[PDB]
Amino acid sequence: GVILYGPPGTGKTLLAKAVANQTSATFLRVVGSELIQKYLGDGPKLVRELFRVAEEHAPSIVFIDEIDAIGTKRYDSNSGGEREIQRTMLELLNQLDGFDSRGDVKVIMA
Amino acid sequence: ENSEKIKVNKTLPYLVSNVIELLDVDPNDQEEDGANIDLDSQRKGKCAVIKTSTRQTYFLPVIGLVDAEKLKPGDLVGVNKDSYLILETLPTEYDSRVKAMEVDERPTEQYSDIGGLDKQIQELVEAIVLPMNHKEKFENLGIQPPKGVLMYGPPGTGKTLLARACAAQTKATFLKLAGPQLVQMFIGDGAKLVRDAFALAKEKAPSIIFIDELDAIGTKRFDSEKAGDREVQRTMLELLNQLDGFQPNTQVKVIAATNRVDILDPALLRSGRLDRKIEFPMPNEEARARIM
Amino acid sequence: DVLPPEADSSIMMLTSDQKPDVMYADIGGMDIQKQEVREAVELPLTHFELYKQIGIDPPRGVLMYGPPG
Amino acid sequence: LRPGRIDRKIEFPPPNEEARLDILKIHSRKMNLTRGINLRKIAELMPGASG
Amino acid sequence: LQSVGQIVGEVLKQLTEEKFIVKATNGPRYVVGCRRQLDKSKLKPGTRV
Amino acid sequence: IKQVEDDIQQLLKKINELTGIKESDTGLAPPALWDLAADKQTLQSEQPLQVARCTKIINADSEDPKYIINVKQFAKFVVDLSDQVAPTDIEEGMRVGVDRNKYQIHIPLPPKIDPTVTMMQVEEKPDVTYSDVGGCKEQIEKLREVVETPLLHPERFVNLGIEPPKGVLLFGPPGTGKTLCARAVANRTDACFIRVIGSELVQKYVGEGARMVRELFEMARTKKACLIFFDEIDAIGGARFDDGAGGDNEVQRTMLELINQLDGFDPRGNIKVLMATNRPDTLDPALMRPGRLDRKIEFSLPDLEGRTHIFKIHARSMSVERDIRFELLARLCPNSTGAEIRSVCTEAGMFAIRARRKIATEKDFLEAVNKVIKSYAK
Amino acid sequence: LKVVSSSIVDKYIGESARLIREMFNYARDHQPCIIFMDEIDAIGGRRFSEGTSADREIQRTLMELLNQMDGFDTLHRVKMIMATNRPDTLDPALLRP
Incomplete structure (x- = not known):
């Protein structure tokens, strides 16, 4: 996976759209904020469904639209604050460091 | 002729039902409605009722096939789905007989085989065992026994091991209750479970009810907003009132333990509540050697 | 056959009563609110026609907030 | 606020003396009252205030 | 055991001297009859049956 | 040509099955089909449960001969004389036995120590074996002694009169081989690796969370020799002592429930627990304490010699020319854990591919350090 | 007439409402009678997160208590004794006698 960083899509967004045509596989674009839910079950179920959906459609490109929730780790591994954002953050990692793709999933992070 | 007749209805599928009201005068009552639109519930039942488990209520006049005085307002009866008459009486208690009640009829532990635990043993033996036997001494004094004990200190010290050794020794039944187990998804369920636990205890006499937790049965919050966690509170309160409601039984002995070091959730002011205090003593080098 | 809908009971308490009751006691001194309710409730029922003539509709719903005690 | 996730962002003016005159007129067509009234005066009586 | 079972009902209203509204629990709402051995004095408005 | 053959295949199977269903139809029958994914020469006659599904329940007992045990919302009906033989093991229900609730009903098979219904990941044997060893070297040596050795040679431990631990703890960054190590032993040790994600649980x-913990342990007991891999238990692992403040209680209940099962009456068995934490500090003293957690296996800053072994692993795939030596560069390079050491190498192959060369070069290596030094610092 | 609060709460629809009501009804026929409520905290809870999880039952019971008062019923010779551990969940209609 790669990370594209800049003041919101003036060429980040442009480049992604362009790349999906080139690459000739299924493009799936996910809005990352939308994974956040203030409901105990909902948020984790969604990230695990997101991974499930990838696997069927493989090879596939994952475009992850920016989140607030990848900004916070602190020095705890979970906190009495908003628990869910880190609970979710962890499962993103577990999926990644559990299974490496050469091409089954390609990740664009933004 | 009568004997064959009754027998056929017994072979299953069969309806067991629960008698809600004993009574044997003022018939008629009501169940179910019509429809259209706007929603408010209603239910009734009188004379004698049995509510069968399709959720249907039935009016029967009594028979001598089983006696109604021997029956109660809250009893399980075996019913002949023909005329809807009570063929027989079934045992006591309804619904769950606790969803996970562990009975240990004889524990495998003995405290005569472990020394160096000694200080704690001396206090324990003196607390529980002495009222039952030594009763004659108590009777002459005119003071009554305890009913509950508290043990507090760092977990995992083999505090529990000594509790299992006393149970083995004494000839009570040991009943293990775990505090998150009383908690359910289901609404109001736990209080029934505890009431039942108490009731089963009454029949078994003597008994030790061992309550793990004073954290999942030792919170109740003193927070202003606490309403959502009402379930937890209702159960805890239920135990405390079940103790306060009547005047003690010498059929139950209760021992309570913590699982996280020290909270405040008042449950120790009377002796129908807890009153005995066992402390874990900090490690003595001499004691460690003895264990080794 | 057709039959009209009928029922009138509840055990959550829903009454249609042929007996009116009470009066305002020491709970009274409603006057300012009294005047506003007099205009709202009583006139459209008593006189539908007056409201239609001017061309302005009556109310359909009214809200009361405050403790019932 | 990032441009091009924007197109037009349009102002809505706070109400005014000219404006008030004609809303009053619309409303009046719903109900019956006397003819021979000067409404012009009535809008003026109003300070600023919402539609 | 030969004897018939007794269903619980409440009367909504009395339609005709032969017809009654009952909301029973063998099935749903019904229009039902009543024995011609039974008193008129027992017809009372809103009772358990 | 193929088609004729396929039609003949349906038809032959159909005639034999029609006769069998006509026959099975009489006297009714259990839950509704056969699925094979074992062998037919090993067939059980104990089936898992925690509730009793009944469909008929034909049996032999004197007080009645077709006794039933339910608890279901509609038909919770039970035995007419308590504790009289009912289910016929798992006849006409496939999990008929006894209800957890109880109504003083017969138990040929228990409502606990069963796999029952689950939501589980069980992951058959991996393929990996040594892939970041060098500074992961210590972690390997100890893990074999704890997990493998008791299963290989149990009879030895008994003579001595020693019993081995039940859990070990893993810490440091994941995907550095902290993670690999648990799969690498799982493949060697030949015992089922059961992966539970604590966060999912x-x-x-409420109460569901406890239920889950319990279910896991019943399954764990049945199978004897298994590994429970807990992925980053800190969500329901410790942080926490505060005793609630709004659903910090619900997660705490799960944490406490696990303790009960561990410290409890159960014993270890052949069951092994691998725990995964970030920094172990987070976790509470109860989770740390002996009589469940004893050995904590660590990660470390890898010595220079170590780095080389990892590079050595990589150099079999990667076309090289060996006349230069990576160790000299490696001393000069930042000291960093195993994952960065593989990554710089991986970066190196790309430069070649642009260069339009097929063999490694001294040149490639110089470039990699500048990017990598930048990447930690973002 | 003795009340244990957590037997009034049940996992069934409208039982708390049916039960309280009948109970109250029986007191008026039978009068005089004292209804002793021990540790109301199944009636104690004005919500804050404004759930209807279990919380709908809290609202169900509370509403019933007020409905009896709001009615044309008068506790004619009927006496009420309440027990509370900590007072903070009282309604604004209770301050008024």
């Missing part, structure tokens, strides 16, 4: 409604 977390539920929207």
Whole structure:
């Protein structure tokens, strides 16, 4: 996976759209904020469904639209604050460091 | 002729039902409605009722096939789905007989085989065992026994091991209750479970009810907003009132333990509540050697 | 056959009563609110026609907030 | 606020003396009252205030 | 055991001297009859049956 | 040509099955089909449960001969004389036995120590074996002694009169081989690796969470020799002592429930627990304490010699020319854990591919350090 | 007439409402009678997160208590004794006698 960083899509967004045509596989674009839910079950179920959906459609490109929730780790591994954002953050990692793709999933992070 | 007749209805599928009201005068009552639109519930039942488990209520006049005085307002009866008459009486208690009640009829532990635990043993033996036997001494004094004990200190010290050794020794039944187990998804369920636990205890006499937790049965919050966690509170309160409601039984002995070091959730002011205090003593080098 | 809908009971308490009751006691001194309710409730029922003539509709719903005690 | 996730962002003016005159007129067509009234005066009586 | 079972009902209203509204629990709402051995004095408005 | 053959295949199977269903139809029958994914020469006659599904329940007992045990919302009906033979093991229900609730009903098979219904990941044997060893070297040596050795040679431990631990703890960054190590032993040790994600166990409604913990342990007991891999237990692992403040209680209940099962009456068995934490500090003293957690296996800053072994692993795939030596560069390079050491190498192959060369070069290596030094610091 | 609060709460629809009501009804026929409520905290809870999880039952019971008062019923010779551990969940209609 790669990370594209800049003041919101003036060429980040442009480049992604362009790349999906080139690459000739299924493009799936996910809005990352939308994974956040203030409901105990909902948020984790969604990230695990997101991974499930990838696997069927493989090879596939994952475009992850920016989140607030990848900004916070602190020095705890979970906190009495908003628990869910880190609970979710962890499962993103577990999926990644559990299974490496050469091409089954390609990740664009933004 | 009568004997064959009754027998056929017994072979299953069969309806067991629960008698809600004993009574044997003022018939008629009501169940179910019509429809259209706007929603408010209603239910009734009188004379004698049995509510069968399709959720249907039935009016029967009594028979001598089983006696109604021997029956109660809250009893399980075996019913002949023909005329809807009570063929027989079934045992006591309804619904769950606790969803996970562990009975240990004889524990495998003995405290005569472990020394160096000694200080704690001396206090324990003196607390529980002495009222039952030594009763004659108590009777002459005119003071009554305890009913509950508290043990507090760092977990995992083999505090529990000594509790299992006393149970083995004494000839009570040991009943293990775990505090998150009383908690359910289901609404109001736990209080029934505890009431039942108490009731089963009454029949078994003597008994030790061992309550793990004073954290999942030792919170109740003193927070202003606490309403959502009402379930937890209702159960805890239920135990405390079940103790306060009547005047003690010498059929139950209760021992309570913590699982996280020290909270405040008042449950120790009377002796129908807890009153005995066992402390874990900090490690003595001499004691460690003895264990080794 | 057709039959009209009928029922009138509840055990959550829903009454249609042929007996009116009470009066305002020491709970009274409603006057300012009294005047506003007099205009709202009583006139459209008593006189539908007056409201239609001017061309302005009556109310359909009214809200009361405050403790019932 | 990032441009091009924007197109037009349009102002809505706070109400005014000219404006008030004609809303009053619309409303009046719903109900019956006397003819021979000067409404012009009535809008003026109003300070600023919402539609 | 030969004897018939007794269903619980409440009367909504009395339609005709032969017809009654009952909301029973063998099935749903019904229009039902009543024995011609039974008193008129027992017809009372809103009772358990 | 193929088609004729396929039609003949349906038809032959159909005639034999029609006769069998006509026959099975009489006297009724259990839950509704056969699925094979074992062998037919090993067939059980104990089936898992925690509730009793009944469909008929034909049996032999004197007080009645077709006794039933339910608890279901509609038909919770039970035995007419308590504790009289009912289910016929798992006849006409496939999990008929006894209800957890109880109504003083017969138990040929228990409502606990069963796999029952689950939501589980069980992951058959991996393929990996040594892939970041060098500074992961210590971690390997100890893990074999704890997990493998008791299963290989149990009879030895008994003579001595020693019993081995039940859990070990893993810490440091994941995907550095902290993670690999648990799969690498799982493949060697030949015992089922059961992966539970603690975060998943977390539920929207109370009591469910405890239920899950319990279910896991019943399955664990049945199978004897298994590994429970807990992925980053800190969600329902410790942080926490505060005793609630609004659903910090619900997660705490799960944490406490696990303790009960561990410290409890159960014993270890052949069951092994691998725990995964970030920094172990987070976790509570109860989780740390002996009589469940004893050995904590660590990661470390890898010595220079170590780095070389990892590079050595990589150099079999990667076309090289060996006349230069990576160790000299490696001393000069930042000291960093195993994952960065593989990554710089991986970066190196790309430069070649642009260069339009097929063999490694001294040149490639110089470039990699500048990017990598930048990447930690973002 | 003795009340144990957590037997009034049940996992069934409208039982708390049916039960309280009948109970109250029986007191008026039978009068005089004292209804002793021990540790109301199944009636104690004005919500804050404004759920209807279990919380709908809290609202169900509370509403019933007020409905009896709001009615044309008068506790004619009927006496009420309440027990509370900590007072903070009282309604604004209770301050008024």
